[PDB]
């Protein structure tokens, strides 16, 4: 057992998209820089089965390659579909099958015991690539059922550092096996002064810089030093004189929790879409959906409707936003004033038949078709409100048959001249223009209340993790932190300051009755003072007076800083640290904490 350095060795391509001069900062599996990785010295059996946490970054500097194959598998007990790579002399074959590997990882087919029910096999003919000892590096992982293997075999210099070469590298995607079997253990195959360089691709946030040619120029690990943390906050790779803060980069999220829904049985959402003759125009039904789970996928491909004009909320991403109650209406109007169904519109049916408030976070839907109705007999079944002496209030039933009066004198209920009835029949003929087509419109009203959610999206539900820095998106409130099972009963509802600039502290579990306190993983206003990478590569930290003891330090009324020394002398203010005190960069060449020249 031994440790060594793995600087700038382990960076690969996250996806297969060939971009050009972009900024990629996706939190994927990478090997951090300056990580204490194991260095196996081989001339015998010294390397045991290596743990496959999230990926293996193998490397070897040697000539006349005798270490070429790698042994994969979950338990290596002929239980699951293992992986084998046979590239002895000229026939390279990647077989995804159950091989019982014995205690002899070297060659020549005596490595495995026998065969079993095998699976797909890659027939890749390209070979897996007395002057010096060339370097060959490979990256193995498996995510989303894709066993991706990366390789950047390149001629190395003739033993300049003798441990690991300098410069940045990016292993191009070699192959991608479509098998989705899980792998937990890792080993190697000897094809018989080499060296085994392996590491663990622990999940962290990495930043890369692509070019127009395809190569990656720079890359930052965002987890090595406070300067590295600050570099991944401005979305850049060069820094200058200044002081900047970070946001939860020293501790990276491990897993992801959602737990959005709690119900599996759907609701009768199609009864209002496909049924018999609906309501009239003067009267409109209102079905109140209850505890259920929403599945808008069946409303898209089946029964192709018209445009999904959704006002207030986004027209897409409707399978994630969860509400408390969702009401379903019913209506059928003429195909000449349907545009008045939008919020804030005016007209005939939007003034005396059905009004909409100025704030309506719902959506309209229509499946206008004169085939289910409008027979050739004379259509006078549907009625509508004719006129009203007063204005209609939004979301108000109008079940009333009072004698409408529009003359200079009241009619006293006679139905004569200027005393017409306020309900006039409609006429829907199948042979007419587009302006006389029955639009069976429905205004699905989506509102949010203070009650627990009853019908959420169709996504799945993950497991709850306690005492861990993770992300959680329960009811649209995405939060990165640690959840604690506390006893803070009487869930807060802080809205005094209207939530202008304020975050949350605790939430309620949407699955069962529970309280989860949200705590930041690592914060406190950690501001790093970077003088610039052009001068040196040494920075200091400062805290805005939180604890002065994080669970060459000087005490001031601004917090505590580490990485400098206080100077009793005073000079010109160059870099303001805090509370008037400033710093500079003078000769050894470093930063000081001289007093402000007041």
């Amino acid at each position, epitope marked *: 057992p031994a440790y060594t350095n793995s600087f700038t060795r382990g960076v690969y391509y996250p996806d297969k998209v060939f971009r050009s001069s972009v900024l990629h900062s996706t939190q994927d599996l990478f090997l951090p820089f300056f990580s204490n990785v194991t260095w196996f010295h081989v001339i015998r059996f010294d390397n045991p089965v290596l743990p496959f946490n999230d990926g293996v970054y193998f490397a070897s500097i040697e000539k006349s390659n005798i270490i070429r194959g790698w042994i994969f598998g979950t338990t290596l007990d002929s239980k699951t579909q293992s992986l084998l790579i046979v590239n002895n002399a000229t026939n390279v074959v990647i077989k995804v099958c159950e091989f019982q590997f014995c205690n002899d990882p070297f060659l020549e087919f005596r490595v495995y015991s026998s065969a079993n029910n095998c699976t797909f096999e890659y027939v890749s003919q390209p070979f897996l690539m007395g002057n010096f000892k060339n370097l060959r590096e490979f990256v193995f992982k498996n995510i989303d059922g894709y066993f991706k293997i990366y390789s950047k075999h390149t001629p190395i210099i003739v033993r300049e550092p003798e441990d690991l070469p300098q410069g940045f590298s990016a292993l191009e995607p070699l192959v991608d096996l479509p098998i989705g079997i899980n792998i937990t253990r890792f080993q190697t195959l000897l094809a018989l002064a080499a060296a085994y360089y392996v590491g663990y691709l622990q999940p962290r946030t990495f930043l890369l810089k692509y070019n127009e040619n395809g190569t990656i120029t720079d890359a930052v690990d965002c987890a090595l030093d406070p300067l590295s943390e600050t570099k991944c906050t401005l979305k850049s790779f060069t820094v200058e004189k200044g002081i900047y803060q970070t946001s939860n980069f020293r501790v990276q999220p491990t897993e992801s929790i959602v737990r959005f829904p709690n119900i599996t049985n759907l609701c009768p959402f199609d009864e209002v879409f496909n049924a018999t003759r609906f309501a009239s125009v003067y009267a409109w039904n*209102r079905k*109140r959906i209850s505890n259920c789970v929403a599945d808008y996928s069946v409303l898209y491909n089946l029964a192709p409707f018209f445009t999904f004009k959704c006002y*207030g909320v986004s027209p897409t991403k409707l399978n994630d936003l969860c509400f*408390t*109650n969702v*009401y379903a209406d019913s209506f059928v109007i003429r195909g000449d004033e349907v545009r008045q169904i939008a919020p804030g519109q005016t007209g005939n049916i939007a003034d005396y038949n059905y009004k909409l*408030p100025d*704030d*309506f*976070t*719902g959506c309209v839907i229509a499946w206008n078709s004169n085939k289910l109705d409008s027979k050739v007999s004379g259509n006078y079944n549907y009625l509508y409100r004719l006129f009203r002496k007063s204005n209609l*209030k*939004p*979301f*108000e039933r109008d079940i009333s048959t009072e004698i409408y009066q529009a003359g200079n004198k009241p009619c006293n209920g006679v139905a004569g001249f200027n005393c017409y009835f306020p309900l006039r029949s409609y006429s829907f003929r199948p042979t007419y223009g587009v302006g006389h087509q029955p639009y069976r419109v429905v205004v699905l*009203s*989506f*509102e*949010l*209340l*203070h*009650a627990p959610a009853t019908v959420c999206g169709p996504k799945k539900s993950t497991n709850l993790v306690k005492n861990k820095c993770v992300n959680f998106n329960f009811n649209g409130l995405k939060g990165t932190g640690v959840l604690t099972e506390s006893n803070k009963k*009487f*869930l*807060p*509802f*802080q*809205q005094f300051g*209207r*939530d202008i600039a304020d975050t949350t502290d605790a939430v309620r579990d949407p699955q069962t*009755l529970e309280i989860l306190d949200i705590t930041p993983c690592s914060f406190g206003g950690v501001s790093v003072i970077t003088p610039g990478t052009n001068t040196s590569n040494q920075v200091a930290v400062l805290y805005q007076g939180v604890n002065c003891t994080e669970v060459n330090v000087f005490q001031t009324r601004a917090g505590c800083l580490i990485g400098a020394e206080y100077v009793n002398n005073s000079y010109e203010c160059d870099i303001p640290i805090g509370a008037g005190i400033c710093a500079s960069y003078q000769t050894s060449q470093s930063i000081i904490a001289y007093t402000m020249s007041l």
Partner: nanobody
Framework: EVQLVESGGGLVQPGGSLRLSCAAS????????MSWVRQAPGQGLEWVST????????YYADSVKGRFTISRDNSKNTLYLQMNSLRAEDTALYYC?????????????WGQGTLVTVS
């Protein structure tokens, strides 16, 4: 024209029903949702009542299941909270705040406040 005045007496007996009223002067928004939030000094504020303006179904909290109910009388445009047997922890400073079900998650109109000392 948004004066949501309240009512109520004084101290409450240690265990017994009560009744509170909330008036709405120059208020005609019959689609807003109502709530009886308690914002007494000390601990945080809570949510108890919920009257669906578009609907009308009574939505209560978890600790007030078998407790006081609400009713939205659209005739006189007032709010009625028929209390029940209260414990020592029911002492609060309930208000009468209404808000729109469509839009933000905060309230829009406030009241004056009432005190219920259960001791």
């Amino acid at each position: 024209e948004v004066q949501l005045v309240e009512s109520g007496g004084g101290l409450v007996q240690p265990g017994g029903s009560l009744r509170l009223s909330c008036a709405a002067s120059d208020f005609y928004f019959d689609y807003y949702e109502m709530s009886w939030v308690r914002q007494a000094p000390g601990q945080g504020l809570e949510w108890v009542s919920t009257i669906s303006g578009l609907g009308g179904a009574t939505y209560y909290a978890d600790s007030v299941k078998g407790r006081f109910t609400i009713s939205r009388d659209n005739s006189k445009n007032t709010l009625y909270l028929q209390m029940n047997s209260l414990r020592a922890e029911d002492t609060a400073l309930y208000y009468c705040a209404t808000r729109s079900p469509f839009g933000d998650y905060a309230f829009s109109y406030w009241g004056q406040g009432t005190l219920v000392t259960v001791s």
